[PDB]
């Protein structure tokens, strides 16, 4: 793309130069904090993003997915250019303006979103994929497409193992995973609009955002609205069988049964 020319430059212009609060902005030290913490979850606040460039609100939600990848790549290009040392062993976060249950709608798909919920009983933890390797049946030479590939086919008879292998084989090895556990949603009995339909919806998290939830307990999420990959597509009954899926970017506590006072102390 063209405009991404500017974005990376504009990122790198702030992650270690733009500062509030009387110098040494955290981002210059946050990277290394998490690096020495082996943690890999660099966090941002949209407030400071807005303080830098409020143009960062409307070329974004044409596709909020590109914003996060474009940020992850600035990360990688900041990590090992400065810390090539620990390069043999990212995602980011944002966490600030509330929207409500049953207000996300038809129109709030796949954009800049900030959204809430509560936990209940759900499943365990499991892994997922990223990468395309399948071939070895004729010649089965090393070919190596150049990406970890999510849902991508070409399927030729010509492919570099003597441009052969129209028929097919499969690998069970050299195969990236990423843990994952499913949720169940709930909504609060404090913020009731009088007995409306009980909230539960398909919502999602991921590998690092895992192994922390507990039933009938709450956690505020950034969240962004999407739908199941294929909700019952065939010339069929008098309704499609559609649900809709949300997925977690940053998970931010709503309960805090522990110490509750962050930066009262007086």
């Amino acid at each position: 793309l063209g405009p991404r020319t500017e974005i990376a430059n504009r990122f790198q212009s702030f992650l270690r130069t733009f500062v509030d609060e009387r110098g040494a902005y955290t981002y210059r030290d946050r990277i290394r904090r998490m690096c020495e913490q082996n943690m890999s979850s660099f966090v941002v606040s949209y407030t400071d993003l807005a303080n830098k460039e409020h143009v960062l609100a409307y070329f974004l939600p044409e596709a909020p997915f590109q914003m996060l990848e474009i940020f992850d790549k600035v990360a990688k290009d900041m990590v090992l250019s400065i810390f090539p040392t620990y390069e043999r062993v990212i995602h980011v976060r944002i966490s600030p303006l509330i929207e409500e249950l049953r207000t996300f709608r038809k129109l709030h798909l796949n954009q800049l979103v900030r959204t809430l919920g509560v936990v209940t009983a759900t499943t365990g933890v499991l892994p997922q994929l990223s990468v395309i390797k399948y071939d070895c049946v004729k010649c089965g030479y090393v070919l190596g497409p150049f990406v970890q590939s999510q849902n991508t086919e070409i399927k030729p008879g010509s492919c570099p193992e003597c441009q052969s292998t129209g028929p097919f084989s499969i690998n069970m090895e050299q195969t990236l995973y990423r843990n994952y556990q499913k949720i169940t949603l709930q909504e609060s009995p404090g913020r009731i609009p009088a007995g409306r339909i009980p909230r539960s919806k398909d919502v999602i998290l991921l590998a690092d955002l895992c192994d922390q939830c507990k039933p009938g307990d709450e956690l505020e999420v950034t969240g962004i609205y999407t739908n199941n990959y294929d909700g019952s597509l065939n010339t069929d009954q008098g309704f499609p069988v559609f649900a809709t899926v949300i997925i977690a970017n940053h998970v931010v506590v709503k309960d805090s049964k522990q110490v509750v006072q962050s930066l009262t102390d007086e």
Binding site: R32, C35, E36, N38, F83, P84, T85, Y86, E87, R88, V89
Partner: protein, 567 residues
Amino acid sequence: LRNDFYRQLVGKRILIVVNYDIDAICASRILQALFKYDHMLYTVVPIMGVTGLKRAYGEHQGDVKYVVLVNCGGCVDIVELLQPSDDVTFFICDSHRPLDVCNIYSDRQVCILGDASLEENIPAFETIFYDSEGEDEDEDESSDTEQQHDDSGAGESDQEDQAPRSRKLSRLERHEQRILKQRARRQWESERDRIMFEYTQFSYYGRSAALMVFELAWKLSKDNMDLLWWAIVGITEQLLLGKIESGAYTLELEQIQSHVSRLTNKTNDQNTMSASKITFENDLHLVLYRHWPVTESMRYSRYSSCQLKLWTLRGEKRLHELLLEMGLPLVHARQTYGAMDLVLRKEFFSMVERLAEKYDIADIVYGTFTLSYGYRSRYAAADYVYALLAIMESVKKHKTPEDCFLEASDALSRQHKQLLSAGIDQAKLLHAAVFRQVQSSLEARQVHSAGSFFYYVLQEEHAFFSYPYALGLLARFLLRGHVATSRARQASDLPLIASCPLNASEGMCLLVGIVPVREDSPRNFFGKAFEQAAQKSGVALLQDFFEPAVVQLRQSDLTRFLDSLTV
């Protein structure tokens, strides 16, 4: 020298194997070999103090003429000790530097291996054992003593102008006849400005126990490369400037280099199984660098702990943030180095020499050795003395302490190693039971000023520290923490005290103490200092140990003792 006297060494003897040490068994177990070499049957002895000395030789009262002195001599004019010495030769290879010349002179059954930079005690026997005042070794007006007695002509002999000797000043009269005493005390005492400045100021030690014995046997066409490793045990026991001042540390980087960069029995065929010829390597003397993860070291290192305050967490924040510059893993930073992945343990040491440049601990790297037996292993040069002292276990069965002294002598064989790892069961857990009161100390601030020093006392025993020498370590472990890091130099650097609860042995208040940081070559007045309160009063004191820096009180005769000890 004994290139001639060793020629004498055939008839009966005793090879006592001198008082508690590492270096003794290093420099003796060699000699159970040489005696079966020249067909000599032998007998060897445990010493813990002067107690053992005659309580046993009183059982061995012969005239056995070839006798040892190592790690000893600063005890008695040892003919005064062993009055059964008529011509029974003794043999001097002792490391105890401050010894009396009465055992040098009257040189009947003693041999001086003498070469040193101290020409300061020349007639010290010719006056000290020669003078007195108010003295009776003389004639008298009475007709009974008008005969040739032991007319020492000295401060022993008359003061009425009847004395051949004492040509030091006039005898008729200086101003009177009785000024002899005046000059006698002048000549006696004016040098005791230096003499009593000797043996009543501090004490320290000399040199090896078998380095000469190597060189003695170097002439014998003996390339017992194994014995070199036996040798270095005694070297790094107290050549280590981390413990005891050498200096020759950095000057035998030439010599033993000039030994073994020279000495190569195999320039062509040395790469095989049994005891490959050795290496010198620039390494650490870090706290058991090799065989367990870094996170044992990074706490248990005094050289880290002296500069970085690692009992607390800022050290660890400082730690990992300095592991940024390496970017080490963490799982791997909590498994054994030898167990880690391989390019890491391989590549690791190379960078630490350089990227310890900026972080206040540049002097972790020193010079050392390393060798093996076979392919189960690669033992390490420095990684050997510490497993030993786990067998110096202070069990009160009445059987262990003598017998476990024998196990040590069975330890340093290639055949005997299953036992050896048992030390490592014992050693590390000690090394982290080290902190077990320390952070309880530095925050309790149990350091006591106590006037012109710093002062501590413990009041509750460890089964570990019933055994004595760790008492020095804990003393050597902590004053860095609070006393040296939260302060200026005026308010930091002073020596220290370190008490030992005998919660089991009826109560007798054992103790050791040590100098401040960066004052090492300032030898410890504790060589005498504890005589201060004792010389004045003394209460049930002991110096039964061969060691200088060592004592034993009663449960409750220590404080007013310490009050006298204020100075």
